[PDB]
Structures are given as C-alpha cells and as structure tokens.
From a paper:
In these proteins, a varying number of internal repeats, binding the peptide, and capping repeats, which shield the hydrophobic core from the aqueous environment, are stacked together to form a superhelical repeat protein. Designed ankyrin repeat proteins (DARPins) are another class of helical repeat proteins which have been engineered as an alternative binding scaffold. Here we show how we applied rigid shared helix fusions and the well crystallising DARPin D12 to construct a crystallisation scaffold that exhibits ideal peptide binding on a dArmRP binding surface without interfering crystal contacts.
Flexible peptide linkers can provide an effective way to ensure peptide binding in the crystal. This resulted in a dArmRP design with six internal repeats, an N-terminally fused DARPin D12 and a C-terminally fused (KR)5-peptide. The crystals of this rather bulky construct diffracted to 3.3 Å and had a high solvent content of 69%. Furthermore, electron density for the fused (KR)5-peptide was visible. The limited resolution, probably caused by the high solvent content and possibly imperfect packing due to the flexible shared helix, did not allow to reliably model the peptide in this data set. The combination of this elongated shared helix with a peptide fusion of the target peptide to the dArmRP yielded the first structure of a dArmRP with a fully shielded binding surface.
Numbering used by the authors:
A (entry chain A): 5 to 496, 501 to 507
B (entry chain B): 5 to 496, 503 to 509
The structure:
C-alpha cells in the first residue's frame, strides 16, 4: 500500500521516504478516509520541505477534504508562515472556503497570526469575506481580542484607498498636462501615459477612464512631429487592449486622423499610424468594419508596394488583422486588390514579410468558397505548395495553415489544391519530426479527404493510407484520433489575430 | 487431510466417500507427489460416476501430471470409451500432449481401441500429430498390428472428400437432366436446383461449379413459360449470393435474355426477370455496370409508369440497386430519365411505392454534387419537405435519408434545401420520441451546418441551438455526441437483395 505509506511518511516528516515512495509510484494525491492528502498533512504538521516536494511531484494545492479544507486552511491555522508563503506561491486558493464559510484569513485572524494575515491580504485575501456566522476576519479578530490584527486590517484598507486616490490624482494631472502650452511638459506627460498604457489592459482602462482619449486624439493633429509620434504611440498602446477599449479609441475619433497619416511623408509617423491601425483591427468584426469604413484598405494595399521593409511588414500585419473575422471584411480586402501583392510577396527573400503575407493569405482563405476561389485565381497555390519543402518550421506551419484553409472549401477548390501537387509533400510531412507540423499537414489531408470520390481516391493514390494507419501508434493520442477520422473519411474557420 | 482421503476414495471407487469428502472441504484438484488428481485416478480405474462427480465439482478436465498426462490420456489408454466421451464433453484437450509428445490418439491407436480412436478423431484429434520418435497414431497402429485402426484413420481422412464427390455427382445428374427432352424431368431438376440455390451461398457455389449456369441461360429461351419462370427463379436465387457468383451469372451471358424478357407480355415472367436483374445489380460496380451496358435502364424507366404495382416496385428496386455504388452508374440512371418519374412517384398513394421511390432518390443523391444538383432540378425538395411532416415513420426515415444525402453536397445545394423550408420541420423533428428519426433529422441538420457561414446562420435562426444543447443529455450517447458535433460546426446509399 503506497498510498497509506505516503500519507504516514508525509505526516511524520520523512522527506527521503516521501521522495522514494513518489519515485516508486506512490500517488502524490493519495487521500485517507476524510480527504486529507499528504499535502494536507505536511502543511498541518509544519514540514515545509515535504510540502515543496509533494507540490513538485504533482500534488494539488487546492485539494478539498470532506469538509472543504485546503492545505492553505491548515497552514493559516497552524501559523506556519513559510508554508503559507509557499502554498500561495504554488496557487493556493487564498479565498477558498470550507463548508462553514471559513477562509484561511478567518483562521489567521481568529488566532492572531499577524504575519499570515498580512501575507494573505497581500496575496488577494478578501478582507470582507463573511463566514457562515456573518463574521469577517476582522470580526473574528475583534471577538477574540486581537486588536493587532484588526488595526492591521484597517491599515491595509487605508493604504489601499490612499494609493488609489494618489494614482487617480496623478493620472488626472497627466490628462490635464496634455493640453499644456509648454512643449516639454506635455511631451513628458505623453510619454509617461504611454508607459502606463503599455502595462496591460488594466492600466489602459485607468488611463481611458481618466479621460486621456480625447486629448490624445486632439494631439493627433499637432504640427510638432515629436509630439505627434508620442501621441500615436500612446494610442497604439491603449488599442493593444480589449475590444471595448479599442472601441473607446474608435469613438474618440482616431481612425480618420490615422488613415490620414497613412499618406504621411515621415516614415516614423507612418509606422506609428500603421501600428495603431493594426492594434485597432485586432478587435472584433465591428471594429474591423469601422477601420474599413474609414478608408484604410486602399492606403494599406498601396503601401504594399513600399520599399521600406518595416512599413511593408506593418502594412501586411494590418491587412491580416482586417482579413480576420467576417467574410464581408475579407471580401473588402479582396476588392481593394491585395491578393496580387500578397502572392508576389510570397516569393520575397525577406522571411518576415514572407510569413506576414502567408498569415494574410491564410486569414483570407479562412473565408467562404468565394474568397478561397479568389485566392486560387490569384495563383497562390504554386508558391504555397513549394513552401511545403521549407526547413523553416514556422514558414512551413504558415503554408500549411493556408493550404488547409484553402482545402476547407468546396470540391472545386480541393481539386485546385490537388492539381497543384500538394499531396506528395503533405503525405511526406505526415511523418515529420515536429508534431505541430505533423498536425497541420494531417488537418490539411483531412480537409482534402472531405471532398468527393475523386479527391478521396487521389489522396489514396498518393500513399496516405499507410502513414495514416501507422499514426495509430503515435504517442500523441490527439494525432491518433485525427488520423483515424481521416481514414474513416477516405473509406466512406480557423482564424488568427495578432496585436 | 481431506485431500489424501479424496484421492484414496477416487482411486478405490468410493463414490459416496468421494462426494462426502468433497462436501467436507476436500480440494477436488488435490494432486499427489506425481501430479495425479482424483480425476486422473477415476479416469484410470474406470469409475465413470466418480468422473462425472469430480467434473461437476470443478475438477480441471485438463489437469497435467509431472509428465504432461491428462485424464483423457489415461482414459484413452485404458479403453474406457464412456469416460473418454464424458471427458471430451467437459472440455478435455483432444490434442493435448505429454512430455514425449504422446497424445490420447497415440494411446488409442497403440492399443487397438477402435471406438476411442473414432471418438477422438471426431472431436478434432490431429491425425498427423507426431511424438518424440516421429510416430503418428497410424504409425503406432501399424507397428503393433492394429490394421483396423489404420483403416479407421484412413476413413476419417477420406469421408469428407467422398461426400463432396457424392454431392458433385448428384449435382451433375441434375445439370444433365436440365438438358432432358421430357418436360417433367427438367421441371423437377429445375425446382430442386432452385431450392438448393435458395439454401445459401455455399449451395449457390456448389450449383455454379456443377455447371448449371449455362443450362439455365439456355433455358431462358424456352417456349414453356413454366420452365422459363422456374429458370428465372433459379437465376435470381443464385444471384442473391456473393458478387463473384453474380459475376458468374453475368459471364454465363444471362443479362441480354433478361433485358429482352423485360418486354414480355407475361407479367409473372416479367416479375421474375426484374427480381433477377435487381439481385444482379445489387453487386459491385462491375456487376451494376454490366447491367447498365445490357441496356436495362430504358425498360426500367418505362416500367416506372406501369399500372401493375408489383412490377413498379420491382423496377424501382432494380433502379435503386443500380443507383448504389459508383457515381458513373448514378449518372447513367439520371441520363435514362428516371428522376422525373421518381419525383412523380413521391406523390404516390401506395406507401410501399413511396418508400421505394424515396430509396431510389436517396441513392441517387448519395453521389457527387452533379447528381445531387440533378435531383434538385427535378424538383424533389418540395416533395421531400412535404414528406417530412408525414405521420408514417418509415417514409419519414427515408425522406430524412434523402435530405441528409442531398445536404451532403455543396453550399449551393444546402442553400437550395434551406430555401425549400426544411429547417423548421427538421428542428421540429429534432424533438421526436423516435430515436432513429431524431438521429436522422440530426444528421440532416449537421450536414446543413457543415456548409458555409450563411447556412449555419440559417440553422441558428431556426431555433436549432436550444434543442441541440438540450440533446447533450439524451439517453443515447451516439445522439449526444452527434448533437455536440453539430453545435461545434455551427460555432466555427444502401443496397438490398431478395431470395
């Protein structure tokens, strides 16, 4: 019985024996009759080392016993500050509750564990969580006479409120500086606001709520190229966030100025405008259709003939983000004449613009049979098939994306792919060392098998059956499943955005 | 020690003491120093009753001693025919061998136990099993002068082939009578042969090998309508068999005579000829193409407008069987103008003819998008949609078959199906008590979801999502999985014979 041995060893403190039993096959999450794991016991007794060891071997940090107790509950009661620290660092439920609504914070407050109270609050313990008796950690600290803990909680709350108020004050001051007649003052506030907005979506909403969006849009018309670049940077950053925040940027009226700047003669201003547009287009179909209605596609397609490879790369980035989502948007991109430039860029020696044109074409081919047939008519398939032999694994994955999306179409498009000689290289890749490339090639073949009898027969003639059958012994069961589905098909979309 | 007592009782013959000691806790398979169980001893001494008792109490019938001898070895040695029979009936190893490769058959033959040799050979004893000296049971029978046993072994080897030859003689006599100048002899032979052919595929091959096919094809030109009808019956029966046997019937040159008899004024001859043709066309694409090349389709299509409903049914049956298999054959059926007549017969008052026309249209729609579009242009979809609300469950399953096959086509055909108003009625049927009808309608909805985004939108607007999610809890797990697959899709031909 390795489970009982592991439970007892963890409870006693035999680190070496715990390691041995786990190495020998002892279930690291073995529980006794009440749901207490060796991790519960280690946290309870105070065996920090065994806690770490068990967590390293796959112990569930939030395992609930029959009463709903977690190892963190136990650590918070006992007063093992270090174990509380480790468990919280390993993902312990700081606000996890038992059957009577007692959370580790309640325990720490009942017994006056000041250190653990502070740690739990710092790791996200809700100070106001009530238990089955309507008692908060502060309530229990007061009822048990722990003035220290109650004042500590009050102090944490006061510091939190003070920091919130100071942060709001500074952000409002920055939004005010944005309208300054002093150049350096406003330029500094611009840069710092951009920095805040680049910390993630949470910071972005702070800036937006302070009211920086309209001020930034106003600066977009400035004649000071330094100021203008700084404003564009801040806008692109805040548009890197959620789709609601992108829509806020759009409502502020940024798109007209941006599409205007697309015709800018200053390469840095133009790069910043393209960045902003692309981050905007990473949103939903509504934001993308807004970008289209602003008249951006003509200028982007025009910029596809740019000699500056960074501007070209960014224009391809934007076109891809717009070609994501709906078929009306993809058709808009097609109507603007982007496909010729994209197929041309498929033969570019620059691998980055190559991957970008591939990403754009894969997105365009994710649409309907109309858009896929337009990709085919533009002559994309020769180059895509040629790219199947690439040793560059990411470019190969890109070409496979595009080919499986083209093969998601009707029998006519699947026949266009087969006539392009894609099957030998696909069956070959089917035995590739890289599992993601194998999966992509298998998806492609599977969407090919979904055609008529002509296409299924062609796949058979290309020698796919043997390798598909061999894949049944693949260690990865997902590949087994997809290959079996393909076999049954013979014997009878996916879009990507980047910010 | 109850085990030793049981051994002693079994060897002595104390039946009552054997049973008693077994009741007192004696192990029925107690082995002594040599590996001999009470069953070994009972078989060796000749205590049939004790053998039965021990085997009924769980005695291992194939227990081996230190030399590999089983109780069957011992019984075959001693000559206890009855004990050998009982042991074999309880699963004794007829080909079990000892350490020197001696099997019970070796023993029975060495000692001239004729009865036991017969029993062992009938139970699968290897006549060619050798022992460590290179001696077969027949070899030992000869070396010890048991000529009787050698003749018995030769007879076991011969008898099966001898009976095969007797059957061949009888079949040759019948095939010869097939060329008799007297009517009655020929009629008797015909009927007896037909019955043989209706006994199953082995009998069919026996008849074919006897050379009956050419005589039957010759008789198809007879002026005695009784003889002709019996010949057609016999050919139909043998064409109910395997596809190689159907191809034998075809090679013998039967199809032209059948196609001629199709214009016969004898309705019973015509019914038998159509039955034979449908059985032939039930085979593979080679047989169906043979039937097509014989020029049968014009007469079948013509018979679709027949007043005799039995003849109409059989013509639809043949056309359906042709419409199975390959798309070349389905196209042949389309070119013969069968789709108009089938679309007409969809409004037939005869429910059987309605199921038959549905089955035909379904097989036609299982092919490629060309054939499905031809079905659509014939105006089938209004009639199929109307039939979706039919209170007849089998006709409904057939209509759903046809619709799920038509919806297997391209996005254009799925849109034609949607335009015919099938979606409300399909969603409605999705709430049917009948699990098979539910599953068929579910297949239909799923093939609609397998189209483009427009079709998925149409399905969503029809209120499919609610019932589809409800179906995730359906008792039938296959239906649960099919409904889940349909949900994921939205958020991104049979043959018949007669004897």
């Amino acid at each position: 019985d390795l489970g009982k041995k592991l439970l007892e060893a963890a409870r006693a403190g035999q680190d070496d024996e715990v390691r041995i039993l786990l190495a020998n096959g002892a279930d690291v999450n073995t529980a006794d009759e009440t749901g207490f794991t060796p991790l519960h016991l280690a946290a309870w007794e105070g065996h920090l080392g065994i806690v770490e060891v068990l967590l390293k071997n796959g112990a569930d940090v939030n395992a609930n016993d029959e009463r709903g107790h977690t190892p963190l509950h136990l650590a918070a009661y006992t007063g093992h500050l270090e174990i509380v620290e480790v468990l919280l660092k390993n993902g312990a439920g700081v606000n996890a509750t038992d059957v009577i609504g007692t959370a580790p914070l309640h325990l720490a407050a009942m017994w006056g564990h000041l250190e653990i109270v502070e740690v739990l609050l710092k790791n996200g313990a809700d100070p106001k969580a009530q238990d089955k008796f309507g008692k908060t950690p502060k309530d229990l600290a007061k009822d048990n006479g722990h003035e220290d803990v109650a004042k500590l909680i009050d102090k944490k709350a006061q510091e939190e409120e003070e920091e919130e108020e100071k942060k709001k004050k500074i952000l409002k001051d920055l939004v005010k500086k944005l309208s300054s007649p002093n150049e350096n003052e406003l330029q500094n506030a611009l840069w710092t606001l951009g920095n805040i907005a680049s910390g993630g979506n949470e910071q972005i909403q702070a800036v937006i709520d302070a009211g920086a969006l309209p001020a930034l849009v106003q600066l977009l018309s400035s004649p000071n190229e330094q100021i203008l670049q700084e404003a564009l940077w801040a806008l692109s950053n805040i548009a890197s966030g959620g789709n609601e925040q992108i829509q806020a940027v759009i409502d502020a009226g940024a798109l007209p100025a941006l599409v205007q700047l697309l015709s800018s003669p200053n390469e840095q201003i133009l790069q910043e405008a393209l960045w902003a547009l692309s981050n905007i287009a990473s949103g939903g179909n509504e934001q993308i259709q807004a970008v289209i209605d602003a008249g951006a596609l003509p200028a982007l397609v025009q910029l596809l003939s740019s000699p500056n490879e960074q501007i070209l790369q960014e224009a391809l980035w934007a076109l891809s983000n717009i070609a994501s989502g709906g078929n009306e948007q993809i058709q808009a991109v097609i109507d603007a004449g982007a496909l010729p430039a994209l197929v041309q860029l498929l033969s570019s020696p620059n691998e980055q613009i190559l991957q970008e044109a591939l990403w754009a074409l894969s997105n365009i081919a994710s649409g309907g049979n109309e858009q896929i047939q337009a990709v085919i008519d533009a002559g994309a398939l020769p180059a895509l098939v040629q790219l199947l032999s690439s040793p560059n694994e990411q470019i190969l994955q890109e070409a496979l994306w595009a080919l499986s999306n083209i093969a998601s179409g009707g029998n006519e498009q699947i026949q266009a792919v087969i006539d392009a000689g894609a099957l030998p290289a696909l069956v070959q890749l089917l035995s590739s060392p890289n599992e993601q490339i194998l999966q992509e090639a298998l998806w492609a073949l599977s969407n090919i098998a979904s055609g008529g009898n002509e296409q299924k027969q062609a796949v058979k003639e290309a020698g796919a059956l043997e390798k598909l059958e061999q894949l049944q012994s693949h260690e990865n069961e997902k590949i087994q499943k997809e290959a079996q589905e393909a076999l049954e098909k013979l014997g009878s979309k996916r879009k990507r955005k980047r910010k």
